[PDB]
Design a protein around this ligand. Sequence first.
Ligand SMILES: O=c1ccn([C@@H]2O[C@H](COP(=O)(O)OP(=O)(O)OP(=O)(O)O)[C@@H](O)[C@H]2O)c(=O)[nH]1
Lengths: 49, 794, 73
Amino acid sequence: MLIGNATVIPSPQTLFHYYNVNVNFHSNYNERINDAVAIITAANRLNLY
Amino acid sequence: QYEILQKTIPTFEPKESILKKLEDIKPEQVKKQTKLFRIFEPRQLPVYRANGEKELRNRWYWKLKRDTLPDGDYDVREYFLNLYDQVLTEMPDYLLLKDMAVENKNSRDAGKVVDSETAAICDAIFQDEETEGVVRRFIAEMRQRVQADRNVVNYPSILHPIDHAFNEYFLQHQLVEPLNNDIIFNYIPERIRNDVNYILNMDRNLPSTARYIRPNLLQDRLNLHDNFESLWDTITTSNYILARSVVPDLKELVSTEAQIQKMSQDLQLEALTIQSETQFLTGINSQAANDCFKTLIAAMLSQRTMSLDFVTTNYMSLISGMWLLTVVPNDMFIRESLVACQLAIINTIIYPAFGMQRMHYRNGDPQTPFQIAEQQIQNFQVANWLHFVNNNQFRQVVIDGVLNQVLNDNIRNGHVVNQLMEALMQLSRQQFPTMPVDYKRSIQRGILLLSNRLGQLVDLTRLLAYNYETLMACITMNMQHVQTLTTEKLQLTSVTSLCMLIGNATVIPSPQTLFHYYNVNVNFHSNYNERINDAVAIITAANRLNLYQKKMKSIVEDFLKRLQIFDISRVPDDQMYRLRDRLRLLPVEIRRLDIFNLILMNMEQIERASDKIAQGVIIAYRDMQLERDEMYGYVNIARNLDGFQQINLEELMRTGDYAQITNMLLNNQPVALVGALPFITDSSVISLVAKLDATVFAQIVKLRKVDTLKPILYKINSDSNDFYLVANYDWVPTSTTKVYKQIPQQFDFRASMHMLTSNLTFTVYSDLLAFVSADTVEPINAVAFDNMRIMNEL
Amino acid sequence: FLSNNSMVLYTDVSQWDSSQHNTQPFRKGIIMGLDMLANMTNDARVIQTLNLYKQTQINLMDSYVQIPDGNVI
RNA sequence: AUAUAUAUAUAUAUAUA
RNA sequence: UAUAUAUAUAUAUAUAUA
Ligand SMILES: O=c1ccn([C@@H]2O[C@H](COP(=O)(O)OP(=O)(O)OP(=O)(O)O)[C@@H](O)[C@H]2O)c(=O)[nH]1
């Protein structure tokens, strides 16, 4: 009981920034699994206790 | 020797508006027009022949007066709602033509034409040497025709046929009805002129000329008592304070100031000191009898719900509450406070009298404790009064077109007191077996101060139901019985001051304060239905004109404003957009419906016959001959938008997806843009051969914006420079794009004269109850609905 | 009402006179309250005493204090 | 030659040609 | 055999408070 008849829309400048911060975290989360796996596995083929 | 140190206080303007009572609402000041409604005006234009050369004579044409048309196809419809609000305020109530009739400067006999403008036109044609002879001969035989026996006249005019259909409608549809002596007496309601006590008199008789404007007194098409519990609270607290003003003061209280001096100089002579014959009680005054007589009548006529206020430890205020519930119907007393008074009579006075156990009445039982103690009691006379209180209801009958809630027939008689005091006597002859003897002596002393007053209480019921019956003839709006939000506190220790302090003097409401209570319930009810119909005619004309962007809170915001009793800024958007769904469903009144069709039928003839706006440009990408006209010469005009695919520029700005046009503008498809474009005039011919008209559309591809469009409308004629290219070389001018524009109409003088008619004389009268001067019969013998009188008790 | 699920809250404004919320929004809240009360009654005398208690709030919305020092006021 | 507002409780005192 | 009803006197000074 305080809303009016005037709608709000996510403007496309803050709709591409929300996309380019969810891609840039998802492409950072996947690029650090691939770095941490490639060192764990390379510490095992090299027989590093 | 002073010194001023002043600082900046921040300005704070709270949202508010002025609120007037119903006593001072000014009636609608009647509108009569002074000049005709003109929107078209003849203008002098040069004329060009079929070659293109300028002719020696000139020609007259109809153009607009102040042609300010906004661009874009949505702003044009926003202009025509604004035009529709301009004809309504100019629409007159009564129109006489003797007020607006100026002399023709030159005629056969010196007659009159109907306006200062249409005399300025007919003298502009006379001295113009280029005019024909038979146009000049028509102005000579242009006089008025006057007929005295029917008092109508016939003044000539020179009006556009759109302008004539707006002025002809103002003359035949007027709000004046004739008025005489036998129609002033029909203005007074039927329960007053058919009443014995008031004798109606008048001095002057009105002529066969005088007219009056009848108010549209039809009931509220909005059901503002249905689901509107915050607007019906303030429309009945505005009626309760009006009704409190006209309820008269009791004759035992009021007298003039000098009569106190007139009664003090003979008080020591004539010793009359216990003539009033009452036993005094602490808490009894006469200022509460006068108060409770006004908050019993004025809370019935406005249908407020009273709330009882009392203390349980007063055994006399509970006995006087027995008279209150048996006269006023229990639907008016509020349920949380009727029950706590209806139970307090049971547990104190009725049930200890019979020795029964005092009732366990839990909170919120659906049966009120008189409706549960007519079954549990075994007497016959106190179970006959408890049946009347359980079934005392208002009787909703419609009288003279106004539904108003008359009382039960026994209450107007007085016979309910003879049902109560027959029951209040059997309850006093009981033994009170459980309670001690002093508790029996405390009621039997107090229940006998009310049974000794039977002649003065069978008559208060007559007088209280006659002041309510008389004043109810003066209402006009439909009184509905719906429980309101806020209540009016009636103290039960102030009914005791009413029940045993009245006597032998009828107070009947004088007819000068019945005609005032009726002339403020008409002046508010006619200020209601002329604000419904003013705010329905814009809501329906907004949806009919296709205004999808207009938020219609604003034209309900001023509907609640012009009703002068509402505060706007404490009424939210919730109670102003529910009201739009009710005002939309109503039929718009016939004067506004018949004049919106006179705009809607030719909102394309006003729009097309004006400069500085053109209804879309068409593009062809091929040489085609531009048509020869007489007011333009040679113009790339197109009268019909036919053969081409259309793009709606109202929609191309709305959705904003330009992918259709910018893929259709690079490939050179023939496109006819549709909208309302501001066009410029390029009168030179060497701009046409250089093809300037095609180079203006390429700013839609690089830049998305389409409102910065200016199509080119050529005009090739003799006054234009470099014209000899058309004269020497045998070529007709060819353009690429032509403008969809309409030719202005010719001013044919003999076909535009109209003979406007109206009456000769009125005398429009404002209110009609100034003439009839009423007076009341002596209140010693004043007659109720029974032909026996009231205040008959010795 | 002091218990272990309750919190008491005592606040003292630094100066109740000469606060920002007391110059304009306190007078104009009372002057509005005497407009809705001028419609409640009907007398020429209860309105007139309620048009004087409104007039003392219009006159105090701007005020001046007379304090002297040395020889100047 | 002489400056101390308003309200709320509480206590003391007082009324007369 | 029978033992009445009803909640805010005024003025100045004084202190506590706002
Ligand atoms: O003699 C007085 C004392 C107080 N008051 C009124 O009581 C109000 C509150 O009095 P306070 O003493 O609480 O004011 P304050 O908040 O300015 O105090 P500090 O924090 O500065 O210590 C004041 O602002 C004034 O309206 C008076 O009218 N007269």
